[PDB]
Amino acid sequence: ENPEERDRKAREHIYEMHERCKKIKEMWALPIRPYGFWTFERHNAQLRWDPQISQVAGRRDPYDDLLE
Amino acid sequence: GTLGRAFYSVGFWIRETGQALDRLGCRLQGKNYFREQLSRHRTLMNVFDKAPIVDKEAFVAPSASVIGDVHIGRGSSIWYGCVLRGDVNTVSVGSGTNIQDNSLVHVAKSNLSGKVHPTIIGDNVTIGHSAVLHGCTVEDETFIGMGATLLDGVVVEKHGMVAAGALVRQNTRIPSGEVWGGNPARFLRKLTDEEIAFISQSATNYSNLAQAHAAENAKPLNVIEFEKVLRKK
Amino acid sequence: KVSEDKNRNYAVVAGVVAIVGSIGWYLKA
């Protein structure tokens, strides 16, 4: 092989690997329990469903019948 | 050769596929006749390119098995139930020679015990009923008694006789004009001239009897028997 | 002249429909 080119890809590997060694270690530090996951809309199902059944017999405030 | 075997193998793929297609076609028409158990016996059987070469004037009984490279000369006869297998090496039968019913003429199946010898049968030879010939040479105008066994390397010289039921051990040479018998086969006596005359005349008689049986077997298959088998209940 | 097994004929039609419909399904997708 050509000694000049062989010795040059050798430099690109290291320069690229010393400065490339940071990206993957950031994923390993990602929290498994995200910040405020219960805030995520998928977890607030009852907050959006229950108002739709708030007038259903069986879960009404007793005074709602007296005024309606 | 190797290319020939490759094409022979590929050929089997195409044939297997075509026959399966034919069975599919028959099934769509509601026919099951391809399920019939019919005999796959072949009187002459090839092993790749090793095929029997049989003279037109030689009788071969339909039930006989001739497998591989086997040569049968003019006026010779292979009788009912005979088996001749030359695959690892060759088997040759000369002219005017009778191989009697249920005889076995074969070569060594493997070269484990050394190089596989061929079986050479000369002209005007008589091979008795249910004899076993295994990789041996049998010269012209000799007599092999029925039920006798000849192992590989044996040589039966011309006008030699092997008595019925004899067991000729490996590499034994039977000299001319001598009668050998027993287990193991040993010299019994000398052959008389009347016995030589009977050897020749019995061979010529067998060639005529062969002719008669070949004419008998060559007759067209009877259609009444076919209809009787078809219409059975 | 004619295949008489009606259920067999129906099964043949079903297999043909499956094959042709599969070809059309691939072609138009």
Partner: protein, 269 residues
């Protein structure tokens, strides 16, 4: 980064040769003993000539790794693996390629009973061992060294002479696997610092004296079993005696060298 070399004869084809031989032999009937014998012998001989050529184009002035080529594993390219040799590994590749045809030739007379399984096992061994000697990565060095255990186990157990081959094969497998697991622990220990297993990078990272001591102990656990060093040498007499002749040849001539190669290649520098 694709590190593809420019030379025609490279390492990947020399890896592929016995692999192709093994795949071809997989499908040939055991009745065709002559064909099996010739195909195996010729594959091994071609591999030997290929290694000789690799010697010819060697450059004896550089401290770098020569004929370096790369092989991608994932499209993410986080983990990408390199092969290459130097003046410490070249002759071991040559020795492996030279010894394998000798092994096929030693069993020539008994090949009718040996079958194609004998030749296939030795060819697979050849492929795995050449790979091991040609790896610029701790993790792949690990993976391909352990892989040789399977065909070596089979070789000792099947074609050994007497029933002591059972105990010999068990001990070989278990000792070698214990050492290998120790060095796997070391490999993971390294990966947690560096985030990589590429040999070239590890040659340019600085390890603490303390963690150098402990990682060196973990490497020593594997290598001393491999060498062998006392007192973990007792598997060797049993295994090298009970194995068939060619099995003993491969065990002593190549497999023993893997511990010293590991010392030269990872622990000392």
């Amino acid at each position: 980064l694709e590190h593809f070399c420019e030379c025609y004869f490279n390492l990947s084809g020399l890896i592929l040769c016995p692999v192709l031989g093994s795949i071809i032999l997989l499908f040939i009937p055991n009745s065709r003993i002559r064909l099996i014998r010739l195909i195996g012998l010729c594959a091994s001989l071609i591999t030997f000539l290929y290694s000789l050529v690799l010697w010819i184009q060697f450059d004896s002035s550089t401290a770098k790794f020569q004929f370096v080529e790369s092989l991608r594993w994932l499209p993410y390219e986080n983990i990408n693996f390199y092969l290459g040799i130097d003046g410490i590994s070249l002759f071991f590749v040559i020795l492996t390629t030279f010894l394998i045809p000798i092994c096929i030739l030693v069993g020539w007379s008994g090949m009718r009973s040996y079958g194609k399984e004998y030749i296939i096992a030795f060819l697979i061994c050849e492929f795995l061992m050449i790979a091991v000697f040609c790896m610029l990565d701790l993790l792949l060095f690990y993976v391909f060294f352990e892989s040789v255990l399977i065909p070596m186990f089979i070789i000792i157990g099947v074609w050994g002479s007497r029933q002591r081959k059972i105990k010999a094969a068990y001990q070989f497998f278990l000792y070698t696997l214990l050492g290998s697991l120790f060095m796997l622990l070391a490999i993971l220990l390294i990966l947690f610092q560096t985030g990589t297993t590429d040999l070239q990078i590890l040659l340019t990272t600085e390890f603490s004296e303390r963690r150098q001591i402990f990682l060196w102990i973990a490497f020593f656990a594997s290598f001393a079993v491999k060498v062998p060093m006392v007192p973990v040498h007792i598997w060797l007499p049993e295994a090298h005696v009970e194995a068939p002749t060619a099995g003993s040849v491969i065990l002593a001539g190549i497999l023993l060298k893997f511990g010293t190669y590991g010392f030269l290649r990872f622990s000392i520098p």
